[PDB]
Amino acid sequence: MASRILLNNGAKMPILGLGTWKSPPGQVTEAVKVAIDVGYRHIDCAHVYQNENEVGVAIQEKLREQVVKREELFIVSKLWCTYHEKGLVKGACQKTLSDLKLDYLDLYLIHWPTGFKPGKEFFPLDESGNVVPSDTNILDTWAAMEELVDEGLVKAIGISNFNHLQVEMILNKPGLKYKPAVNQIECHPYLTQEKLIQYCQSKGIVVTAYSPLGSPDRPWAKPEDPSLLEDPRIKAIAAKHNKTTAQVLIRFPMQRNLVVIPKSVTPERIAENFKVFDFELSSQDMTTLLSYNRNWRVCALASCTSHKDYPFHEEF
Ligand SMILES: NC(=O)c1ccc[n+]([C@@H]2O[C@H](COP(=O)([O-])OP(=O)(O)OC[C@H]3O[C@@H](n4cnc5c(N)ncnc54)[C@H](OP(=O)(O)O)[C@@H]3O)[C@@H](O)[C@H]2O)c1
Ligand SMILES: O=C(O)COc1cc(F)ccc1C(=O)NCc1cccc(C(=O)O)c1
């Protein structure tokens, strides 16, 4: 299938990218270098991941080496929750640009719909452990994102972890200038997201699937938890196709017209995970994988469940 999907800003986005959350700073430069060498052209980043400087070293070295041209790369980052105030958005974007050593981002996302009190701490807490919210709402943060397009800092803007009513709020914003291009959400066979995906796709918003392998390195994992990579039913589909379980888990969202961003710092897995353009899952395979949904989430924080904009109380 085609390697890129057309966004509603007129640009094309590679359907496979490299994730960087949890990639150690002493390993991520080589991970990104290897990824670019083996064909990746989309890197998913964020300020909160604390490794954008090291990602940037890799990007700059591959541009200097002329392995790739800047126009061939698709670099994504995200505005952290403590920067939702309109007066902080530009500086947050500029810090990311400085660290990544770029003069524009291809896509900049509101990382979560929940704004937090500005300051040095990424999760500012009250004395009882609740996150301290900001009063800035999503619509004003969206207007600040639109300014970044008009200043040339970013080519596209979007959202992440927004539920369908929050997407709808953006789409219904008085005076909306640019629609979200992307909603980046958790999606895999245990959290298949049919309802939210259909809503976003019906509005022309491209969905990116995060944690497609079930994030086995997430810091809050428990030994009892479900494991996609070890599920014998998924292993059987992979064996039938002479592919790895990870390759099936990556191809699955691709065939739903999603973008997918598996993370690895292991050179052999970075290369393996890209070898997903040479086989097809059948419709029956796809429906079987969808049947494994259990509404299980890698990403959600008990500390934010009382925030007015917490996204996961709604069904979708
Ligand atoms: N927008 C958001 O709120 C949000 C939230 C979560 C994630 N994300 C993005 O999505 C990316 C991907 O999600 P994720 O990092 O949570 O997890 P993931 O991509 O589902 O899983 C990553 C884990 O799988 C392992 N792995 C990778 N390829 C493998 C293979 N072929 N065989 C076996 N194990 C393999 C990695 O190990 P090694 O690295 O040791 O090889 C790592 O432990 C993130 O890095 C981030 O960029 C965004
Ligand atoms: O967020 C990602 O991309 C990956 O997870 C992280 C990565 C980090 F470097 C540091 C913290 C996290 C994290 O705890 N996220 C979950 C999160 C964040 C903000 C609000 C909510 C909420 O439930 O409202 C949930």
Side-chain angles (χ1 to χ4, degrees), residues 1-60 62-68 70 72-85 87-119 121-126 129-146 148-194 196-221 223 225-229 231-234 236-267 269-274 276-279 281-293 295-307 309-316:
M1 62 165 62
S3 67
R4 303 198 289 174
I5 189 165
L6 180 64
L7 301 181
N8 64 9
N9 76 334
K12 292 181 180 183
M13 182 171 186
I15 68 177
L16 186 49
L18 181 71
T20 65
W21 174 37
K22 311 170 264 59
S23 297
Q27 296 169 32
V28 74
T29 299
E30 181 67 9
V32 172
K33 285 177 173 183
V34 167
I36 291 171
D37 287 343
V38 305
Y40 290 73
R41 298 292 180 266
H42 165 190
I43 314 295
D44 183 76
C45 310
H47 177 67
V48 78
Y49 300 164
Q50 300 183 226
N51 59 6
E52 294 192 311
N53 191 40
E54 293 86 353
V55 171
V57 171
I59 296 170
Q60 179 58 27
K62 293 293 165 187
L63 293 170
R64 187 195 67 85
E65 285 180 333
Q66 299 178 15
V67 174
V68 283
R70 175 66 186 94
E72 299 169 330
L73 291 178
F74 197 98
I75 309 303
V76 183
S77 186
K78 319 188 190 77
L79 178 77
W80 184 248
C81 299
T82 54
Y83 308 94
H84 282 208
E85 281 76 7
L88 299 182
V89 168
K90 189 180 186 184
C93 186
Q94 287 176 317
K95 170 56 169 163
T96 281
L97 287 170
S98 180
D99 287 349
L100 293 171
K101 294 161 279 276
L102 301 174
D103 61 10
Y104 67 93
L105 297 173
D106 296 275
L107 176 64
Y108 196 51
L109 305 177
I110 305 181
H111 201 151
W112 291 82
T114 51
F116 304 164
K117 186 189 68 157
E121 289 176 8
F122 290 155
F123 285 86
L125 305 180
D126 68 26
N130 305 295
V131 78
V132 180
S134 171
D135 66 14
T136 300
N137 93 316
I138 59 176
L139 300 187
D140 288 335
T141 307
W142 190 253
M145 297 288 285
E146 295 176 323
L148 302 176
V149 174
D150 290 329
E151 295 171 312
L153 275 66
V154 310
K155 301 294 193 201
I157 49 173
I159 58 190
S160 183
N161 301 295
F162 279 47
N163 72 36
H164 91 284
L165 297 182
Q166 295 170 323
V167 178
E168 185 175 64
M169 283 296 300
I170 300 288
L171 294 177
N172 292 341
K173 178 185 181 299
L176 182 68
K177 193 175 190 183
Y178 304 116
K179 293 178 198 169
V182 167
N183 190 13
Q184 179 182 129
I185 64 178
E186 188 178 335
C187 185
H188 48 68
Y190 299 156
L191 186 73
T192 50
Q193 300 268 29
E194 280 94 333
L196 181 57
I197 287 168
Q198 173 62 19
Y199 177 79
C200 290
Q201 292 184 337
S202 81
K203 299 300 186 183
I205 298 169
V206 166
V207 173
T208 301
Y210 77 67
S211 305
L213 314 180
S215 197
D217 58 338
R218 65 201 183 279
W220 50 82
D225 286 351
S227 165
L228 286 165
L229 287 163
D231 187 318
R233 303 169 297 179
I234 307 180
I237 292 167
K240 180 175 71 179
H241 288 280
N242 303 303
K243 287 286 177 172
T244 69
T245 305
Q247 287 168 331
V248 168
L249 290 167
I250 293 163
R251 183 72 191 192
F252 174 54
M254 293 166 67
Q255 290 188 210
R256 304 176 70 193
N257 300 309
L258 314 177
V259 176
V260 63
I261 53 170
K263 172 268 180 182
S264 182
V265 290
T266 303
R269 292 170 169 176
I270 293 167
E272 166 180 319
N273 290 352
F274 203 73
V276 291
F277 297 90
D278 65 343
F279 82 108
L281 298 167
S282 67
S283 182
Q284 182 177 12
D285 287 333
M286 293 293 294
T287 296
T288 299
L289 287 161
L290 287 165
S291 80
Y292 301 155
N293 181 59
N295 304 317
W296 178 74
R297 288 186 189 271
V298 169
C299 281
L301 282 175
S303 69
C304 298
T305 55
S306 288
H307 192 295
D309 301 309
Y310 181 74
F312 307 141
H313 302 313
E314 280 297 320
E315 183 186 338
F316 74 101

